[PDB]
């Protein structure tokens, strides 16, 4: 099969203030060569995750996601580039993109909608 | 929006001996710069369409598709890279891929299943 990036779900509707995990899958034959894996997560014009050389590089991470966004490293060996974002706000609504380079390269879009908060 | 290639339909079930049009769409802002458009159609390890510099190049077209496959040029200005294949046989079943380069580049997969013929 050709190198393809796939998303099990391309539309998330999350409640205000909750935590969400948007998932993105890439092919991992045999074992995982972590050195060759590059994972970029970004929504709109802001970077969220720049995973290069086995670590997350914070150089270009948008300040909104400081201590709020996380890429589970241990799931990468299963071909899962799952992105976690906690305490989502209305500014987190938009189109996310998941760009993965591991031998080949591909990307998919994911749409997230955030509901308005419920009053007291 | 980011440069993306999309397919309105990713699974075709066609009858034996019929004609099918599998569609693939790419973004065309303003007018179409035909010189910059490159469209590749291929299924399995065989090329079907190599559209470069405004014409189809037959250099690598698989012989099965000689006078059988066609890329409608006039629809390219609408962002439609629609592939026509006539008199489909059981050998035409498999995964097609639609690779488009126009400024950016992207590709999508399409699965075609061909029914067995009905007897007399």
């Amino acid at each position: 099969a050709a190198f393809t990036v796939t998303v099990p779900k391309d539309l998330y509707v999350v409640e205000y203030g909750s935590n969400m995990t948007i998932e993105c899958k890439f092919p991992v034959e045999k074992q995982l060569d972590l050195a060759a894996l590059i994972v970029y997560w970004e929504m709109e014009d802001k970077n969220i995750i720049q995973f290069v050389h086995g670590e997350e590089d914070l150089k270009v991470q948008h300040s909104s996601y400081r201590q709020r966004a996380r890429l589970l490293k241990d799931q990468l060996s299963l071909g899962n580039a799952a992105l976690q974002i906690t305490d989502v706000k209305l500014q987190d609504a938009g189109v996310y993109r998941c760009m993965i380079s591991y031998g080949g390269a591909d990307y998919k879009r994911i749409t997230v909608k955030v509901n308005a908060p419920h009053a007291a | 929006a980011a440069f993306t290639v999309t397919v309105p339909k990713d699974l075709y079930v066609v009858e034996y001996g019929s004609n099918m049009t599998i569609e693939c769409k790419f973004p065309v802002e303003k007018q179409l710069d035909l010189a910059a458009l490159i469209v590749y159609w291929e299924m399995e390890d065989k090329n079907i369409i190599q559209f470069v510099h405004g014409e189809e190049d037959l250099k690598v077209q698989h012989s099965s598709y000689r006078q059988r496959a066609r890329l409608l040029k006039d629809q390219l200005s609408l962002g439609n890279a629609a592939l026509q294949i006539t008199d489909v046989k059981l050998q035409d079943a498999g995964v097609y891929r639609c690779m488009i380069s126009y400024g950016g580049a992207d590709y999508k997969r399409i699965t075609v299943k061909v029914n067995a013929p009905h007897a007399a």
Binding site: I38, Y40, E42, E44, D45, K46, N47, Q50, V52, K59, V60, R97, M99, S101, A105, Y107 | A2, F3, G103, G104, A105, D106
Partner: peptide, 28 residues
């Protein structure tokens, strides 16, 4: 215009220049 550090962001990946990055568009 164009954000900073797009050179480090793009020099190792095809994500930019293929139209995939909105942070660093192909011609920013």
């Amino acid at each position: 215009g164009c954000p900073a550090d797009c050179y480090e962001y793009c020099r190792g990946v095809p994500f930019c220049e293929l139209g995939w990055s909105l942070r660093c568009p192909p011609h920013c």
